[PDB]
Write a protein that binds this ligand. Structure first.
Ligand SMILES: Nc1nc2c(ncn2[C@@H]2O[C@H](COP(=O)(O)OP(=O)(O)OP(=O)(O)O)[C@@H](O)[C@H]2O)c(=O)[nH]1
Ligand SMILES: Nc1nc2c(ncn2[C@@H]2O[C@H](COP(=O)(O)OP(=O)(O)O)[C@@H](O)[C@H]2O)c(=O)[nH]1
Ligand SMILES: Nc1nc2c(ncn2[C@@H]2O[C@H](COP(=O)(O)OP(=O)(O)O)[C@@H](O)[C@H]2O)c(=O)[nH]1
Ligand SMILES: [Mg+2]
Lengths: 427, 158, 427, 160, 160, 426
């Protein structure tokens, strides 16, 4: 009876969302048409047997949407759920907040209300977007500004393509990221984060694939979400609701930026020689080489750790491994969160896609964890944003499209205030 | 045997080209239906496809796609004749030859034709419009190719 | 949908644009008649990006070809694709400007452009939302420059909230083809800075080296030299017409690339180049291509990168490959070549990926870049214009035609102030 | 059978032309009946059409439309003369050939022919004219063309 | 008999050369599967391997390895035909020759074939590649060679 | 996974290097066209040491060929295997230096080497762990000598931690082929001492002597002497590319035979050479080879062990053989030939065995030597250069090109102090 709504913004939300619902129909045993040869948690149904997924995909430049319109899963989705824009925002937050962001927002807000009327009971929103993107940073920001006005106390989550420190596919990406960490600071309850340079390092040493593409990045990122919201989808011994782990991970209205880390990122030949004990699946989670975001825990202190398991896991060694996890002095914790571990157990094991580059595993583990190691990750990005404003580069488009130049000065102060919050917490 | 394999490879390459140019065939069928105004009547015959190509088709690319479909049908008929020229007789081979001739006939009711894996043309197209009219035309090629492969396997076994 | 009209002018422009359409009709697979015969439905999808639909299965190219001397456009209709272009799109003047900027702008300028403007506005408003403009004019020919600059000036005024991109031919010393290149290029570039968003500069002399050094071409007529110019321009807009794993457009390029409105002069490079005798002798991979990318032999202008700093560098890749390799091999070139890029703009490199490669090729690479070494392409024209003006050389034409000598000094002084702008950010 | 197929398109096109000129044809037979004073006799006889054209024709437009109809009859007769010799024979094919010859013969009454759903030529007329006056003449063409399509289907069906 | 033994010795030398170039065959199969994007469907036919070499082989050494494998299979089929061409055959010999024909059939599914001791062809490949990807294609040589040797021994054991 | 760039300069170096790439293709089975036809997977396992990869199965040699006179490279590319190398590595100058070292160091080759740096940089950056550069040249020809010794000096400044193996034919007393070759010797070995690690002194008179005495071949032209030369460079890396029972890469050898930077000049050899009438009468055993390696006849130098003492000797075997007789026969000759070795270095011989043999021979052996007979070879060079400079003759081609006579006397000091230091350890 419960329902969940997944909103994806930008083409970064498109390729991820194309794989995110690729596994979902593969888990339940769903053909690409939407009919079979627990499904009501995400998917809706038609009385003739067909299934219409309760999801919305938004983009402004259609040639990435045009893959979906004649794709392999063309009939899986809905025609008017996939809103087609006219012209790309093109890495400009002032594009997607004053001119483009104001056209199709009311068309986006109308479709959700049509979906919310179908929602006799809804749990919350899973928002997917990118910091460096044009649509994913502009059109998300005033949507969350408008979704929070329309809805009072509904659950809100975030999965962001966080800027990796070294690799880069954009130049004015720090301006989009700074303009995203201001608006989403005020209203987003949670913000899970990933970065690509972690995945390339992960895809090299773990899957033994020399040449990965974003499809291989889609399959790993897409299965993180599946194990996150498998508890509502499938029954288990100790289920975790969307309202629960947004509350067990957020200490303050401003400190709402967790991480992720997946295990076992393991290939077909490798897992045939490496056992998957209950200890070894979760011991690899705290190893930094498996960390899903490029930062090290040695300058960091953990704040909270929400863990979700799936498959044949016995709850005995869940606690025995976490007890062994707590033993080592090398792992650092603050002195005001000693009992800060969460356990979620789900009955259904994860499944492998046809031709899966991962391993078909009996058991699994995910960790959605906040820490203070991320403060160094913006200890470089703030210096990047202060660097270009000193020579006032790239401003001249932002002024003419509607936002003020003073918003650069004001949102800088919020950037230091968040960092100042991390220092006092992490003492 | 060897010449049958060569003709089968040529038909397979032309069918792969048609699968790459599949959306233009759907556009050709839509334009032919719009020109003929026969929305109620589904396209279910190779003769219907030929008549729509000759009378209700004006685009050069649409005519090229229809000519490709007609050339595929002609190649299937010629391969069916060459199979009889090459082989003498078997029970399964005779039944498969009868089925291939009936499917390659221009008056074959194609509405009951539904292909299987790995022919994902139905999944690539829309099965609402395909189940209305386009599905038989989409799936006639793949079932015929599978039957030809089965007849080649039987000929290899014999 | 979003749409770019193509603009040609002068004898030089019409020869390039005739060869420019010889490759984009090949990539989309178009016969000289005008009827599609490609082997891919993806070509047909975004085929309206350059074309207009027409009855009988025909596709009429949409370009405005303008020349006051009718000798060139006869060879355009005598070209291989002379029977595909629109006969109403050809506007011809009575007398040519005769390699004079003065004759092309004020005297014999207005009597043709208003007949030209009957063609442009009919085609521009015929779409729903136009994306921009793409003009090929040369700074050495008076008919191409002064008439073309007047086309730049007013179509900008007619559509103010719109991007314009120009591919201009800058001169070279050893291929001196017009006596008043220090006059005509000076009288052209002064109005391009104020009133053109994007400017692309191509120089003839290095192309004469490239056909000898890179491809080892034996008999390089202008059919060869325009072809390397032609295919370079096609890769700039390849995502507009084909999908990609990371889609981008011209104004995506602009936002990442241009720090200030008055510093917008670029350099292009095309680089999967391999000689005819080495087709079996080279491997096609990104370690080869990145090494081939920033090599000094493959820039299409008579410049050297070591005399300046690259402010920003953009690149529109194309072909099927692994997203890590560009994300890697654009990173260490920022690392090892530390001084060859600026230090006040972090993450200088801009990357994008298109899906469909051109016919006859496996992978392709395209370069667009702004460098601070470009001031020698301006101060040479500045020191030559002072050499012209000091002995009052060739001023007798402009005195009787209505041009004030103060217009030269206003053009001299403001372009002399601009060369410091490239210089000041260098130091 | 390339000549047969070209004849099939030509006969189809002239059938479309005849159905486009349906309304003038009914008035043509109407004044033909008025001139012949045979109001009791239902028009379903090819020889009656021949005599009516040869005698009771007073206008060039009527002369032309009767030319068109009898040319359709004659070319269908020639097509039947090719069909009787082109095929070998099954009982169904013999029934088809016998029905085709029996319909195209001038010696047979055609008053028992009424068209089915694919041809809507019956409903375009007035009540008594479509029911008893010209129903056989109107439905002669759909029955012959339906036999044509049925023969195409059967010849494509039969393995030779 | 004597020519059959000479053909068997030549086939043994050819199989030794193929075992010396065995990793080249595995690399050729991997390259063909990667080029044809059939990473899920295993190659279950010698005709399938030939088609992959025909359509998706670009490396010259890979094409040479595939051509050597197909020529060794052709020589094995020629020896299977020559056994019936030479000897009359007993009932067990007819059963073994039918097994040889079924194994050397191009349309036969070879995914169920696995070698045993002392043939280390299965150990020459990985466990997953032997179980689901290329075990039958790798191990087709040894069981067929053992069947040919058994047929030769049976033909020697026949009385005069 | 380890790579070597093979620089190849000078007409002698080009002709020697042409046969060098011909044999390692023959040991791996590569046609002149470039289509792989190796009948075994073993050379597929380790091929990236010397070849590179092109699309389609083309294995391109990693050879740079540079020479100031275009006449050789036409004959190089018109050779039996010249249709496979890198045209972009071919950088030919027009004016041959004319056997003058100063021509290759200031005047004409000095401009060309900047283009040579870009070419070797193109080949270097394609890898991840490169051993170093195997350059084949000759001291006799001043085009190879003047340019070549500038290359070792320039690469050493650029790349401090690599290996620098140089195969050069030293000037000979009786096959003196250039009047100014004593000048080309002293002006070149002066750079061979300071900044080169592995140097292989090949003397052609023994190569002339081997074909005369051991082989007795009636018509062995330069296509046949180079065949014997080309085998020895493979034995330098025969354990690098062919895995086996005991493996040793380049610097494993280079550290081991070199006690001090002044002692690094290596006499090479090859060892299964056999007279054509005596294959069937000779038994193929390891003790048969034991006489053959430490035969004085089979060395590639016109030198006598009778004249100087061995310091370090390296003899890598090649074939399927036991370890007993390899140690046991070396125990025999370390016993009996004790006077040849110095008394203060025990365990003189390094033995490494490779299992894979060359095609057409079940077994092979390769010789490296570091004796003190090379001191008199350099001493005879020194006195002739001393006599020539006493008259200050021929210097107008040298002094007329701007270089000064102070470089002559310093090398004359550096030539004697190379071999005077050899005496102290002797
Ligand atoms: N890891 C990963 N990142 C992706 C993927 N697809 C897109 N991205 C990221 O998306 C970012 C590029 O911004 P876009 O997504 O193109 O921008 P946008 O929000 O769609 O707005 P527009 O560019 O105007 O369409 C890059 O940083 C990519 O790394 C993916 O499949 N996997
Ligand atoms: N690359 C290239 N340059 C050209 C071509 N045609 C002309 N040019 C250049 O154009 C310049 C002269 O242009 P011109 O004909 O005087 O222009 P116009 O007088 O305005 O028509 C010369 O410097 C040529 O180098 C061409 O096809 N390719
Ligand atoms: N071993 C050997 N030596 C050669 C060959 N060809 C020439 N030489 C020697 O090369 C020496 C001259 O060097 P030269 O070719 O002039 O070098 P360059 O000046 O760089 O061209 C002579 O003493 C020859 O003995 C050959 O094929 N083999
Ligand atoms: Mg985007």
């Amino acid at each position: 009876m419960r329902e969940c709504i997944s909103i994806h913004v930008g083409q970064a939300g498109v390729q991820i969302g194309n794989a995110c619902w690729e596994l979902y129909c593969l888990e339940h045993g769903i053909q690409p048409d939407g009919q079979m040869p627990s499904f009501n948690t995400f998917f809706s149904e038609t009385g003739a047997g067909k299934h219409v997924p309760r999801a919305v995909f938004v983009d402004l430049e259609p040639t990435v949407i045009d893959e979906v319109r004649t794709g392999t899963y063309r009939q899986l989705f809905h025609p008017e759920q996939l809103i087609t824009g006219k012209e790309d925002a093109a890495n400009n937050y002032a594009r997607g907040h004053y001119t483009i962001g104001k056209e199709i927002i009311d068309l986006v807000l109308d479709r959700i209300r049509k979906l919310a009327d179908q929602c006799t009971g809804l749990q919350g929103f899973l928002v997917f977007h990118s910091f460096g993107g044009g649509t994913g940073s502009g059109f998300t920001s005033l949507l969350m500004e408008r979704l929070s006005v329309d809805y009072g106390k509904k659950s809100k989550l975030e999965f962001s393509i966080y800027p990796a420190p070294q690799v880069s596919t954009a130049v004015v990406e720090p301006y989009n990221s700074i303009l995203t960490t201001h608006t989403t600071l005020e209203h987003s309850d949670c913000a899970f984060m990933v970065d690509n340079e972690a995945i390339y390092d992960i895809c090299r040493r773990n899957l033994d694939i020399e040449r990965p593409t974003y499809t291989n990045l889609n399959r790993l990122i897409g299965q993180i979400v599946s194990s996150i919201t498998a508890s509502l989808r499938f029954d288990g011994a100790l289920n975790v609701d969307l309202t629960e782990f947004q509350t067990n991970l957020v200490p303050y209205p401003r400190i709402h930026f967790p991480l992720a880390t997946y295990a076992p990122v393991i290939s077909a030949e490798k897992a045939y020689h490496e056992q998957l004990s209950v200890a070894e699946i979760t011991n690899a989670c705290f190893e930094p080489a498996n960390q899903m975001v490029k930062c090290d825990p040695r300058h960091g202190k953990y704040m909270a750790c929400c863990l979700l398991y799936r498959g044949d896991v016995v709850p005995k060694d869940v606690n025995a491994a976490i007890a062994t996890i707590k033993t080592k002095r090398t792992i650092q914790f603050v002195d005001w969160c000693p009992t800060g571990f969460k356990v979620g157990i789900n009955y259904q094991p994860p499944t492998v896609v046809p031709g899966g580059d991962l391993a078909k595993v009996q058991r699994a583990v995910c960790m959605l964890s906040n820490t203070t190691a991320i403060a160094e990750a913006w200890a470089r990005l703030d210096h990047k944003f202060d660097l270009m404003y000193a020579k006032r580069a790239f401003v001249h488009w932002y002024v003419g499209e509607g936002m003020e130049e003073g918003e650069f000065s004001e949102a800088r102060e919020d950037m230091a205030a968040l960092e100042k919050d991390y220092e006092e917490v992490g003492v | 045997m060897n010449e049958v394999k060569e003709s089968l490879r040529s038909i397979e390459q032309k069918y792969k080209l048609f699968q790459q140019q599949q959306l233009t065939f759907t556009a050709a069928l839509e334009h032919c239906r719009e020109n003929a105004h026969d929305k109620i009547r589904p396209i279910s015959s190779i003769g219907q496809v030929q008549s729509y190509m000759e009378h209700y088709c004006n685009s050069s690319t649409d005519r090229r796609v229809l000519l490709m479909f007609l050339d595929i049908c002609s190649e299937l008929n010629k391969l069916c004749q060459h199979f009889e020229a090459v082989h003498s007789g078997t029970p399964v081979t005779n039944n498969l030859l009868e089925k291939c001739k009936t499917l390659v006939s221009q008056s074959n009711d194609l509405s009951s034709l539904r292909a299987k894996y790995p022919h994902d043309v139905v999944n690539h197209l829309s099965c609402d419009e395909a189940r209305n009219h386009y599905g038989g035309v989409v799936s006639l090629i793949p079932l015929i190719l599978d039957l030809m492969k089965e007849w080649i396997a039987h000929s290899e076994k014999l | 949908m979003r749409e770019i009209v193509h603009l040609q002018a002068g004898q030089c422009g019409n020869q390039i644009g005739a060869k420019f359409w010889e490759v984009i009709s090949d990539e989309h697979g178009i016969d000289p008649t005008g009827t599609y015969h490609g082997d891919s439905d993806l070509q047909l999808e975004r085929i309206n990006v350059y074309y207009n639909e027409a009855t009988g299965g025909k596709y009429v190219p949409r370009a405005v070809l303008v020349d006051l001397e009718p000798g060139t456009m006869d060879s355009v209709r005598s070209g291989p694709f002379g029977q595909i272009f629109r006969p109403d799109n050809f506007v011809f003047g009575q007398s040519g400007a005769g390699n004079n900027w003065a004759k092309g702008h004020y005297t014999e300028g207005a009597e043709l452009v208003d007949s030209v403007l009957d063609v442009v506005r009919k085609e521009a408003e015929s779409c729903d939302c136009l994306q921009g403009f793409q003009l090929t004019h040369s700074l050495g020919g008076g008919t191409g420059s002064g008439m073309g600059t007047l086309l730049i000036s007013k179509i900008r005024e007619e559509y103010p909230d719109r991007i314009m991109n120009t591919f201009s031919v800058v001169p070279s010393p050893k291929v001196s083809d017009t006596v008043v290149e220090p006059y005509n290029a000076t009288l052209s570039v002064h109005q391009l800075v104020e009133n053109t968003d994007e400017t692309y500069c191509i120089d003839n002399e290095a192309l004469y080296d490239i056909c000898f050094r890179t491809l080892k071409l034996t008999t390089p007529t202008y059919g060869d030299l325009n072809h390397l110019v032609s295919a370079t321009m096609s890769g700039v807009t390849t995502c507009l017409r084909f999908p990609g794993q990371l889609n981008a457009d011209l104004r995506k390029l602009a936002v990442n690339m241009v720090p200030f409105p008055r510093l917008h002069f670029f350099m292009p490079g095309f680089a999967p180049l391999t000689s005819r005798g080495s087709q079996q002798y080279r491997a096609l991979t990104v370690p080869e291509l990145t090494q081939q990318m920033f090599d000094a032999k493959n820039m299409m202008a008579a410049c050297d990168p070591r005399h300046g700093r690259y402010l920003t560098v953009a690149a529109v890749f194309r072909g099927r490959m692994s997203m890590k390799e560009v994300d890697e091999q654009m990173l260490n070139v920022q690392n090892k070549n530390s001084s060859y890029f600026v230090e006040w703009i972090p993450n200088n490199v801009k990357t994008a990926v298109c899906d469909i490669p051109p016919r006859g090729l496996k992978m392709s690479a395209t370069f667009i870049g702004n460098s601070t070494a470009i001031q020698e392409l301006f101060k040479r024209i500045s020191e030559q214009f002072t050499a012209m003006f000091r002995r009052k050389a060739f001023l007798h034409w402009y005195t009787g035609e209505g041009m004030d000598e103060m217009e030269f000094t206003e053009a001299e002084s403001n372009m002399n102030d601009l060369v410091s702008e490239y210089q000041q950010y260098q130091d």
